[PDB]
Amino acid sequence: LPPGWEKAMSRSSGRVYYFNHITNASQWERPSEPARVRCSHLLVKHSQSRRPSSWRQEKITRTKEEALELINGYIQKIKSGEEDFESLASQFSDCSSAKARGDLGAFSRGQMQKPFEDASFALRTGEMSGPVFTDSGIHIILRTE
Ligand SMILES: *CC(=O)N1Cc2[nH]c3ccccc3c2C[C@H]1C(=O)N1CCCC[C@H]1C(=O)N[C@@H](Cc1c[nH]c2ccc(F)cc12)C(N)=O
User: Fold this and answer.
1) Could you confirm whether 46 is annotated as catalytic?
2) Measured distance CA(127)–CA(120) in Å, rounded
3) How many degrees, rounded to 5, is the angle at CA 143 between CA 141 and CA 145?
């Protein structure tokens, strides 16, 4: 299995699935390192963020648990096709990158905070992470290159 992936059993159905502890991604199908990657992200901040403030809200008051619920909801809508990642990032990401539909550009290792970097370089091109925690809040990451 590729880096970070493990086989697991669904609680509701008992069917095998696959989970990546680095990206917190999960998928039913059996999954299939570059010097640089390009990623977009959607950040949801919370009251314990290092700077609980964004262009959306001067004082961010939601709890970390409420932020995780929002992230889970965005992931659901992206995976169902009801919304696309870029549209949700433009509207709801607590970050100046929202104006660029979440695009952070390309980077190598040594530039991003390690949890974000590790998830970014463990994703396949076009793959999306689960919730990824940094001191600023909770991210969804989309590897675009
Ligand atoms: C909101 C947020 O998470 N930002 C703000 C931001 N807006 C951008 C617009 C265009 C390109 C890059 C942008 C960023 C950077 C980002 C941020 O603070 N991040 C990125 C996601 C993980 C956590 C955190 C960091 O890891 N920041 C870097 C320092 C840093 C700041 N700006 C950049 C740009 C590129 C880069 F490679 C690194 C950057 C860190 N703490 O090491």
Assistant:
1) no
2) 10
3) 155
**Mutation probe of ligand 1 site: the residue of 93, 112, 144 with most atoms within 8 A of C-beta:** 112
Whether the CB-CB separation of 84 and 78 falls below 8 Å is answered with yes
What separation in Å is there between the alpha carbon of 84 and the centre of ligand 1? 22
This structure was determined by X-ray
Count CB-CB contacts under 10 A for residue 97: 18
In CATH, the number for domain 36-145 is 3.10.50.40
Residue whose CA lies nearest to ligand 1 atom number 6: 97
Residue spans of the domains in the chain: they are: 1-31, 36-145
Q: Which of 49, 90, 104, 118 to mutate to test the pocket of ligand 1 (most atoms within 8 A of CB)?
A: 104
Which residue spans within the chain are E strands per DSSP? 5-9, 16-20, 26-27, 36-44, 103-108, 132-134, 137-143
Q: Which CATH number fits domain 1-31: 3.55.40.20, 3.10.290.10, 2.60.40.1180, 2.20.70.10?
A: 2.20.70.10
- Residue 70's nearest CA partner among 48, 52, 94 is 94
Cα 11 to the chain's mean position, in Å?
23
